[PDB]
Amino acid sequence: SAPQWFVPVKAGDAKVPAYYPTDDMIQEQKKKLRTRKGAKITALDKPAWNLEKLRKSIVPGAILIIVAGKYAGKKVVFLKQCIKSGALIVTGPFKINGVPLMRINQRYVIATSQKVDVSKVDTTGVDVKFFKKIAIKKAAFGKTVEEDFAKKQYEAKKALIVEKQKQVDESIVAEIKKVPYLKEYMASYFTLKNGDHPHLLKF
Amino acid sequence: KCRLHVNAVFMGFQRAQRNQYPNVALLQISGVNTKEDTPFYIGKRVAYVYKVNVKKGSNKPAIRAIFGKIVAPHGNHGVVKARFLHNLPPKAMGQNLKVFLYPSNI
Amino acid sequence: VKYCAKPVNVAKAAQARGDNLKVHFKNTYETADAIRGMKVARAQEFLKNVIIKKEIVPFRKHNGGVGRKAQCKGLNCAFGRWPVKSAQFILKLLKNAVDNAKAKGLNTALLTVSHIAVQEARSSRRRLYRAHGSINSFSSSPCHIELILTEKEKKVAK
Amino acid sequence: IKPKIVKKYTGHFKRFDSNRFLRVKASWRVPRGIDNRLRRKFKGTNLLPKIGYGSAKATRNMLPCGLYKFPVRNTTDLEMIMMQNRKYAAEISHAVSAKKRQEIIQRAKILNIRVLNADARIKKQEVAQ
RNA sequence: AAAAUGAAGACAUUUUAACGAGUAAGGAAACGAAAUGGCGUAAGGACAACAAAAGUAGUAAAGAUUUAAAGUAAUUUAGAU
RNA sequence: AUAAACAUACUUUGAAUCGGCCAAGUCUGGUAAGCAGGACUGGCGAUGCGGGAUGAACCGAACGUCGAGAUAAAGUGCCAAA
RNA sequence: GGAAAACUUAAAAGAACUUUGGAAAAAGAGUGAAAAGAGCUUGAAAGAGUAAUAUGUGAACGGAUAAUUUAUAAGAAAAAU
């Protein structure tokens, strides 16, 4: 048999030694680069082994301040933690803040003392499948060129499901309007004014 | 839109009378007047954001940033030590550095 | 001796040169520096004014002991002179190069002094008899002069 | 698999007073002067070669591509690194002609051996081709 | 320095521990666990495509100018003209 | 009592060197000297680093290439880290 | 008493006719594999000239650290069941 180091390749009718096998008995192989296996897929209810431990101030129904990222300074309501990723599933109810149903790591939020509670929110869906379904993916590598227009049509085709899962926000919006000045507070931006020293602020 | 940072002054690197160690940069966060108010900021993000007058024929960003972390107090007057991905330029001495609020611990 | 630079387009340029010219390099290095870039229809007029002492040649680099003049205002140089031998030698190379452009068929009115360079040639030594039975050197400072005139036209870059 | 090649000093050890004088070249020479500024390790000028600057033994004499260097002068020279194509790389000598370079290059692809001079002494296939 | 292994791997073997300033001065070659390790110039005797055409070279030598790479360094290597 | 096996005892061959200088809870000659000469030790010579602003000897401490930490002499109105 | 000074090409085929210039020469043209053009194999450093780029209050140069600009330079495989 062939030595472990010997991987025969085709010769374009170029000069070859007498010991090198000819082309009629050489079958080429595809270069292999993927060795590590991907992550396993388990049920939708068991928590992942790689699950964080949320701070004791982060409880469902509380209001969080997003101090980093695209929605920096906004407010959200913490429904539950994604057991398959450890990131909080929050909603800054879209009728008020404009923050959609998104996932944010707990390190980029501040847990306020405000508590909206809100049980019976009907979060039956809105799981790791839902976030993996509305995520916008790239155009791979071998998919011709398909430039620019690939992403634009993605939003239209995934828009309807985004609205469909906005049945979660109907309960919170009515509850938010109950507390005076809370709807205005939620809809606004969090800002650091004069004399607002972070080591002195408390929530 | 909103202000989510506290300005800190890049006073200079950690140094001695006739030496300098550009690995660690000293910062004076606004409103911190003593070393007992530092425990909050130990671990918070710090960004040195500057502006570069690029040309329209290039694709490099016109606003670049160097990030770092506050690691320890330095003296009794609320001065801190920050270690960045790349050492701060000495041209940026006395400029303002944004002290963010994350990684949050509340 | 070869030329320092070749023209962008040969058919739009004319050349002339001189080798081992018996003229001072230090004086000619400044005359050639003053007429660089100006049109040949103007350089022939500037050179004549230098001969009759009506336009200055600023001695920017070799200004050791050179006297101040009234015509050296605005050039950022307080010193200047009127080298006559150097100017005449250039005036004969300009005539040669221009007469070559006519042979090619180029239009004289559009020609400029695009390239003009002076290099140091090989000196010829003499004897200067000094006190106490000593002899020193009395050496010339010849030079090579090269010239390239091109037809000046506006360029385009979309 | 390729380790992190770490160099403890990426600059050059220039001869003392080489910047000021042109007769003094830049190739390093230890100063033996009885009053030399550098050899007494004054502050500011105390940069001399030492064995402590040596790089890691595992990643020594290794090119950035992750392999070592093995010069070749003919096709038969390549046969000495066919078993070690994942450890060595062919480097055609600076005197090998263009005709012989193609034979080495063609055989190296057959034997799956990298060549560091793969685009060396090529023909005029850059303009008008 | 001491343990382990040892006809050939290779990086002058593996592991552990201590150590590392320096003028004058010393440490020639060789010595498998090597009684310091090496770079460079020229000349002489051998080796250099192992199947009977066997190192490179007019498909461009030596030299020169530079661009990069390897080496702690002495220096080496390759690209372009 | 304590320490000591890369301990101890050496043997042979040989290089360089015998112009020295400084400090002192020391001394002699001298009015005295950054003068001349000595007893014991530690240094510079042969030695960089941190401090005394600058300094061959003073104080801390002696150096393979680095990362992080407590420290030494000594400092914490600004130059200058505190 | 007592020096210095070697080299075009294979072959002179050592430019050969025109224009400018008093002339030397220059520009074309031609020979030659290539001007190698006779101050002739290659053509280093010191010193200048041209072009490109950059910098600036009583020296200049070097080292550590970053920023800007330029250059170099790493890829075609692909998940769970």
What is the SS3 string spanning A134-193?
A: CCCCCCCCCCCCCCCHHHHHHHHHHHHHHHHHHHCHHHHHHHHCCCCCHHHHHHCCCCCC
Question: How far apart are the C-alpha atoms of D63 and D107, rounded to whole Å?
Answer: 22
Strands A101-104 and B19-29, bridge-based pairing: unpaired
Look at D110 and A11 and tell me if their CB atoms are within 8 Å.
yes
Residue D31 in 3-state DSSP?
coil
CA of residue A89 relative to chain centroid, distance = 10
CB C118, CB C28: distance < 8 Å:
yes
CA distances from C105 to C13, C108, C129 (A): 10, 9, 55
Chain G bases near protein Cβ (<7 Å): 19-21, 23-28, 36, 39, 45-51, 60-70, 75-81
* Residues 6 or more apart whose Cβ sits within 8 Å of residue A13: none
Strands B63-73 and C135-137, bridge-based pairing: unpaired
Which residues of chain A have a CB within 8 Å of the CB of B104? 67, 106-110
Identify the experimental approach.
cryo-EM
Start-end of H helices in C77-132: 84-104
H or E element, residue C49 = helix C40-51
Q: Cα-Cα-Cα-Cα dihedral of D56, D60, D64, D65, to 10°?
A: -120
Residue closest to C6 by CA, chosen among C146, C128, C132: C146
Q: Which amino acid, D96?
A: V
* Residues 6 or more apart whose Cβ sits within 8 Å of residue D121: D96, D97, D98, D101
Edge-to-edge strands of the sheet including C111-120? C13-21, C143-151, C111-120
CB C20, CB C140: distance < 8 Å:
no
Q: Is A111 on the interface with B (CB under 8 A)?
A: yes
Q: Which two tokens stand for residue A122?
A: 């009907």
CB D91, CB D116: distance < 8 Å:
yes
Q: Which amino acid, D91?
A: E
Question: Strand E and chain D: which residues 67-96 have CB closer than 7 Å?
Answer: 69, 71, 73-76, 79, 91-96
β partners of residue A111:
A64
* Nucleotide minimizing C1' to CA distance for residue B52: G68
* Nucleotide minimizing C1' to CA distance for residue C5: G50
β partners of residue C96:
none
Strands A101-104 and A88-91, bridge-based pairing: antiparallel
Residue C33 in 3-state DSSP?
helix
Which residues of chain B have a CB within 8 Å of the CB of A109? 104
Question: Strand G and chain C: which residues 4-43 have CB closer than 7 Å?
Answer: 4-5, 10, 14-20, 29, 33, 36
Buried-exposed string D63-85: b where 16+ CB fall within 10 A, e elsewhere: eeeebeebebeebebbeebbeeb
Question: How far apart are the C-alpha atoms of C123 and A60, rounded to whole Å?
Answer: 97
CA distances from A7 to A26, C70, D109, D118 (A): 10, 86, 11, 21
Within 13 Å, how many C-alpha atoms sit on residue A28's CB side? 8
Report resolution (Å) to 1 decimal: 3.1
Which residues of chain A have a CB within 8 Å of the CB of B31? 197, 199-200
Residue A63 in 3-state DSSP?
strand
Residue D91 in 3-state DSSP?
strand
Q: Which two tokens stand for residue D74?
A: 């003919």
CB B85, CB B27: distance < 8 Å:
no
Strands A109-115 and A62-66, bridge-based pairing: antiparallel
Residue closest to A89 by CA, chosen among A125, A136, A36, A119: A125
Question: D39: phi > 0 → left, psi -120 to 50 → alpha, else beta; which?
Answer: alpha
Q: Which two tokens stand for residue C38?
A: 């100006």
CA distances from A3 to A6, A23, C96 (A): 5, 18, 78
Within 13 Å, how many C-alpha atoms sit on residue C59's CB side? 17
Q: Which residue in the block uniquely carries the two structure tokens 């190379």?
A: C93
Question: How far apart are the C-alpha atoms of B87 and B71, rounded to whole Å?
Answer: 15
Start-end of H helices in chain D: 75-78, 98-110
Question: How far apart are the C-alpha atoms of A85 and A80, rounded to whole Å?
Answer: 12
Q: Which two tokens stand for residue D19?
A: 């910047």
CB B23, CB B12: distance < 8 Å:
no
Question: How far apart are the C-alpha atoms of B104 and A67, rounded to whole Å?
Answer: 9
- What secondary structure does DSSP assign to A7-19, as a single string? -----SS----TT
Residue B16 in 3-state DSSP?
strand
Strand residue runs (E) in chain C: 13-21, 57-58, 80-81, 111-120, 127-129, 135-137, 143-151
DSSP letter (8 states) at residue A23: G
Strands B80-84 and B6-16, bridge-based pairing: unpaired
- Whether the CB of B64 is less than 7 Å away from nucleic strand F comes out as no
Question: How far apart are the C-alpha atoms of B48 and B46, rounded to whole Å?
Answer: 7
CB D69, CB D116: distance < 8 Å:
yes
CA distances from D25 to A147, D21, D28, D31 (A): 56, 8, 8, 13
A138 burial level (CB within 10 Å; 0-12, 13-18, 19+) = exposed
β partners of residue C21:
C143
The answer to whether the peptide bond before residue A93 is cis (omega within 30 degrees of 0) is no
Question: C37: phi > 0 → left, psi -120 to 50 → alpha, else beta; which?
Answer: left
CB B2, CB A73: distance < 8 Å:
yes
Question: How far apart are the C-alpha atoms of A91 and A110, rounded to whole Å?
Answer: 14
Q: Which residue in the block uniquely carries the two structure tokens 């739009």?
A: C12
Q: Which amino acid, A68?
A: A
Residue B59 in 3-state DSSP?
coil
Residue closest to A17 by CA, chosen among D81, D110, D30: D110
CB A63, CB A115: distance < 8 Å:
yes
* Residues 6 or more apart whose Cβ sits within 8 Å of residue C28: C21, C83, C86, C89, C90, C118, C143, C145
Q: Is B4 on the interface with A (CB under 8 A)?
A: yes
Residue C34 in 3-state DSSP?
helix
C116 burial level (CB within 10 Å; 0-12, 13-18, 19+) = buried
CB D91, CB D119: distance < 8 Å:
no
Q: Which amino acid, C46?
A: F
Question: How far apart are the C-alpha atoms of B103 and A76, rounded to whole Å?
Answer: 18
Question: How far apart are the C-alpha atoms of A199 and C116, rounded to whole Å?
Answer: 72
Question: How far apart are the C-alpha atoms of D90 and D81, rounded to whole Å?
Answer: 8
H or E element, residue C48 = helix C40-51
Residue closest to D100 by CA, chosen among D128, D76, D69: D76
Question: How far apart are the C-alpha atoms of D129 and D126, rounded to whole Å?
Answer: 6
Residue closest to A109 by CA, chosen among A85, A82, A90: A90
CB C94, CB C43: distance < 8 Å:
yes
Q: Which residue in the block uniquely carries the two structure tokens 């057959």?
A: D110
Angle, CA C88 vertex, CA C83 and CA C94 arms, to 5°: 125
Residue closest to B76 by CA, chosen among B37, B39, B41, B35: B35
* Rounded CA–C1' distance between A179 and G11, in angstroms: 111
Strand residue runs (E) in B1-106: 6-16, 19-29, 45-51, 63-73, 80-84, 96-99
Angle, CA A138 vertex, CA B58 and CA A50 arms, to 5°: 110
Residue A62 in 3-state DSSP?
strand
- What secondary structure does DSSP assign to D70-85, as a single string? EEESSHHHHTTSSTTT
Q: φ and ψ at A109, to 5 degrees? A: -130, 155
CB B55, CB B35: distance < 8 Å:
no
CA-based R_g, chain D, Å = 21
Q: Is A200 on the interface with D (CB under 8 A)?
A: no
CB A61, CB A116: distance < 8 Å:
yes
Residue closest to D82 by CA, chosen among D93, D70, D73: D70
Which residues of chain D have a CB within 8 Å of the CB of A14? 106-107, 110
Q: Which two tokens stand for residue D25?
A: 């070249």
Buried-exposed string A47-61: b where 16+ CB fall within 10 A, e elsewhere: eeeeeeeeeeebebb
β partners of residue B73:
B80
CB C20, CB C123: distance < 8 Å:
no
